Design a protein around this ligand. Structure first.
Ligand SMILES: CN1CCN(c2ccc(C#N)cc2)CC1
Length: 460
């Protein structure tokens, strides 16, 4: 039985509007409805992993697991295994996998973050799941962010609290938040960003939707515009949206958007919006292709429509050589030449680097770099040719070229990370000096850059 080098992952997000689902929800798992939909010829082919995010979910974990498993069994004739289920209030994540993957999945983690303080603490936040699939780390975040058209900044703050405080993945990666811990990170949910047009334009917006003319609406989508201005979701991707806004519908039809202010809305308008989203971030030069992104048309119990996304994702095998794991492979080495970090910090402390990777027996601390002043005010930390030679556990190029090195730049004074990034070892050549680059972030905000050259030696 050969180990896979690709899997397909289903991501679903649905705000259920505190109503039980209808008897049939198979269209969701089949990526059928509006948008980028899945070919009919694939309907019987199971995805490898299904990740279901709900919000305003009124069901018990048991009730929802029974509907999900029976749904997938009807579609695929496969009885899926439950990897994980985690619920915060009415926010839930379920991870299901094909039975053949049971002994490929390990290190399962779950966590939640509650957003807001006092007033604003009590129903919004996120749940997450991570695990290893053979040699590949996978993370999944289902978030229900702050509602309301005039709260995009709150949403962006909820995002930063969730990425700072959701504790998933390998805890040995202590300098790194969830945006660096996984080969593939999927973030989805009722993110609650709105189409930011005047209230008086509600019927115009509805007209545009009925004509399937989304361009003038998406140019005012707060998630796209906030992302464009680097206010939120920096270094994440989203597929092009080609489906109608998924909120706010009259229940039991999809023929009507209910946008007018009501006591039940706190006298807020809910102009038609793409509240329900799927985004991802994968390490550099790993295969990840979105194969569907859309909304269902036939599930109408909620004032939101379910959203689906599917992905091809590269995975690697759990590699064993004669040498590592449990020792170094002297035929392998990673060298760094002419490296420097450019930091936005106004501070003057010394800095050192930490290199973290599952290709190393443990993380490596560098010597302190030399601080200089950039021509436009910046701090430049020069490492020159001073960085340590990294000793991988396995030298086989079939393993080593698939790996990644996480970098943190840390203050000598405080041992606090000022910036985190990631370098792919998927190089154009071995035994050859080649440029490398990563942006550096801290709490998911840009703090600098790391650049230089790498020289990778494999056994070939
Ligand atoms: C690195 N890429 C991902 C983020 N980018 C964008 C572009 C347009 C909008 C809009 N509207 C939002 C984000 C640039 C390309």
């Amino acid at each position: 039985q050969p180990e896979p080098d690709m899997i397909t992952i289903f991501i679903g997000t649905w705000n259920m509007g505190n109503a039980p689902p209808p008897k049939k929800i198979t269209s969701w798992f089949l990526s059928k409805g509006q948008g980028k939909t899945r070919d009919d010829s694939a309907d019987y082919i199971p995805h490898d992993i299904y990740v279901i995010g709900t919000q305003e979910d009124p069901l018990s974990e048991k009730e929802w697991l029974e509907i999900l498993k029976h749904s997938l069994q009807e579609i695929t004739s496969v009885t899926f295994k439950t990897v994980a289920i985690h619920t915060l209030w009415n926010i839930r994540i379920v991870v299901l996998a094909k039975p053949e993957h049971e002994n490929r999945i390990s290190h399962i983690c779950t966590d939640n973050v509650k957003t807001g303080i006092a007033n604003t603490l009590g129903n919004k936040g996120a749940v997450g799941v991570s695990f290893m699939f053979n040699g590949t780390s996978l993370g999944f975040v289902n978030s229900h962010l702050t509602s309301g058209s005039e709260k995009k900044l709150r949403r962006n703050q909820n995002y930063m609290n969730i990425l700072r405080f959701l504790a998933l993945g390998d805890k040995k990666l202590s300098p790194f938040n969830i945006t660096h811990r996984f080969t593939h990170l999927f973030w989805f949910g009722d993110l609650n960003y709105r189409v930011d047009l005047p209230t008086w334009e509600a019927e115009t917006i509805i007209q545009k939707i009925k004509q399937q003319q989304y361009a003038d609406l998406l140019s005012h989508d707060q998630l796209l515009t906030e992302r464009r201005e680097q206010k939120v979701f920096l270094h994440f991707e989203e597929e092009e949206i080609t489906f109608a806004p998924t909120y706010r519908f009259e229940r039991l039809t999809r023929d009507k958007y209910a946008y007018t202010k009501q006591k039940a809305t706190g006298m807020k308008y809910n102009l038609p919006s793409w509240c329900d989203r799927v985004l991802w971030k994968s390490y550099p030069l790993v295969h990840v292709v979105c194969q569907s992104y859309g909304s269902t048309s036939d599930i109408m119990t909620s004032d939101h429509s379910p959203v689906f996304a599917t992905f091809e994702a590269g995975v690697t095998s759990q590699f064993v050589s004669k040498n590592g794991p449990g020792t170094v492979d002297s035929q392998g080495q990673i060298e760094f030449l002419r490296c420097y970090a450019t930091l936005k910090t106004k501070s003057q402390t010394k800095f050192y680097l930490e290199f973290h990777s599952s290709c190393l027996e443990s993380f490596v601390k560098s010597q302190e770099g030399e601080n200089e002043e950039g021509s436009e005010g910046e701090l430049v930390v020069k490492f020159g040719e001073t960085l340590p030679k990294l000793k991988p556990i396995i030298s086989d190029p079939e393993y080593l070229l698939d790996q990644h090195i996480l970098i943190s730049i840390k203050s000598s004074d405080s041992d606090e990370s000022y910036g985190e990034g990631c370098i792919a070892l998927r190089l154009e050549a071995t035994e050859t000096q080649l440029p490398i680059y990563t942006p550096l972030t801290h709490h998911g905000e840009l703090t600098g850059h790391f650049q230089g050259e790498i020289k990778l030696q494999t056994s070939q």
